[PDB]
């Protein structure tokens, strides 16, 4: 043989009245479609084979042709939106959902895989898969006392497909669907397989990527301690989605943010804020910026965990996108912090790295930094210490950056700049 058939040969066999012949041609098509160098997906579609493949899904007496067409349709569905649409238009969604019940584990797994590709196209196909009733049979495949008695590759594929049912926005998944899936997802979040664990974190990060009501659905399931545990893992494919989920959560209410602090997340941040992977430092700092946007007692938690020197470090040397988050973290800190907390920030050395970033061409970061300066001067005014801080910004060259920015293109930048000049500078 079934290796390297022409498409016209495949058509001839599928159009024969002979189920065995059809099986040989379907396998041939599967082998064409499973080659890494540009599989002929459009050719297979243009030959009108998808309806015949979908009808083979229902041939319970010929499980080999069920598997071969399932695999063939899987790889078509893995293509572009137009190619996934052709699989959907051929009626494949109900047929795959029926296959979830097959007594042949490799066939139900293939159905699981295919639905994951269809659902992975976007919210519309995701919700169509849900409306056809995929969730109940998928979850029933995972209704065992001990997950570790399932085949590793089977369990990984189910986790990945479930994570696609949690993915995408505009709109987010149906509330009923999320709430039906969550308990199984919480169980997978405690499984020992690193790939199951990564995809479960990814699913949780999707569900926490939204309004506070969505964050609350997840947090109410008690998964935040497990997220913090996974946050400390050595495997970066696990840390990345774990940090994403934590960062999502601390964009919600102050009470939801507090659960992350209570679970111990801040103790991991010395390593996260120096992590050699650029994306980890960026999203660790982004997470910090939304904690320092919180309550003064939560800012005080950041101080107590020794994280202000780590913010000074990121602000001093990091990828610029990480430095921008660090600028945000500081402006949030200085917006809500106490005078004593703001003084502590200055004593840790925030001024000079904050000045140096006034050379960046990013207009938003200059605004963010200039706003932090006002907040910090405001604290010095409640102490008569403005003069001593004015000198600090001068003594490290900050006022060259400020007394120049008064002639900037942006109006809000020019206004804050000459204001800082006239009031102190």
């Amino acid at each position: 043989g079934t290796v390297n058939w022409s498409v016209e040969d495949i058509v001839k066999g599928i159009n024969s009245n002979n189920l065995e012949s059809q099986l040989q041609a379907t396998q041939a098509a599967r082998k064409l479609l499973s080659r890494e160098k540009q599989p002929p997906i459009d050719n297979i579609i243009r030959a009108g084979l998808i309806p015949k493949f979908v009808s083979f899904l229902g041939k319970t007496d010929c499980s080999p042709i069920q598997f071969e067409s399932a695999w063939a349709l899987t790889n078509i569905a893995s293509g572009t939106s137009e190619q996934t649409k052709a699989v959907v238009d051929g009626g494949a969604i109900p047929a795959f959902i029926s296959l979830l019940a097959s007594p042949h584990a490799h066939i139900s797994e293939q159905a699981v895989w295919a639905l994951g590709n269809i659902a992975g196209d976007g919210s519309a196909f995701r919700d169509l898969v849900i409306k056809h009733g995929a969730i109940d049979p998928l979850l029933a495949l995972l209704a065992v006392p001990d997950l570790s008695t399932l085949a590793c590759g089977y369990l990984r594929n189910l986790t990945w497909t479930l994570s696609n049912l949690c993915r995408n926005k505009n709109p987010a998944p149906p509330l009923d669907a999320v709430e039906q899936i969550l308990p199984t997802l919480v169980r997978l979040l405690h499984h020992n397989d690193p790939e199951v664990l990564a995809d479960s974190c990814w699913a949780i990060s999707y569900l926490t990527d939204g309004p506070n009501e969505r964050i609350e659905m997840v947090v109410k399931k008690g998964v935040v301690p497990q997220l913090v545990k996974l946050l400390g893992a050595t495997e970066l494919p696990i840390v990345t989605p774990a940090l994403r989920a934590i960062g999502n959560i601390v964009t919600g209410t102050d009470e939801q943010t507090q659960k992350v602090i209570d679970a111990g997340a801040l103790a991991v941040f010395p390593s996260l804020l120096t992590n050699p992977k650029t994306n980890i430092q960026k999203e660790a700092t982004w997470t910090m910026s939304n904690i320092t946007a919180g309550r003064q007692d939560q800012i005080q938690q950041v101080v107590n965990h020794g994280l202000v020197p780590f913010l000074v470090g990121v602000l001093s040397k990091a990828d610029f996108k990480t430095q921008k988050e660090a600028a945000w973290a500081i402006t949030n800190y200085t917006s809500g912090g106490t005078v004593e907390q703001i003084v502590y920030l200055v004593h840790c050395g925030i001024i000079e790295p904050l000045m140096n970033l006034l050379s960046a061409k990013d207009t938003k970061i200059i605004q963010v930094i200039l706003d932090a300066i006002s907040n910090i001067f405001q604290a010095a005014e409640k102490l008569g210490e403005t003069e001593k801080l004015s000198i600090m910004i001068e003594e490290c060259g900050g006022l060259d950056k400020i007394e120049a920015l008064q002639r900037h293109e942006n109006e809000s930048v020019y206004k804050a700049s000459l204001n800082l000049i006239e009031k102190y500078f």
Binding site: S34, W71, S78, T84, Q110, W113, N117, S163, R167, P241
Partner: peptide, 8 residues
């Protein structure tokens, strides 16, 4: 992570 993936 991958939205879609073929079987190889």
């Amino acid at each position: 992570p991958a939205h879609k993936k073929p079987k190889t």
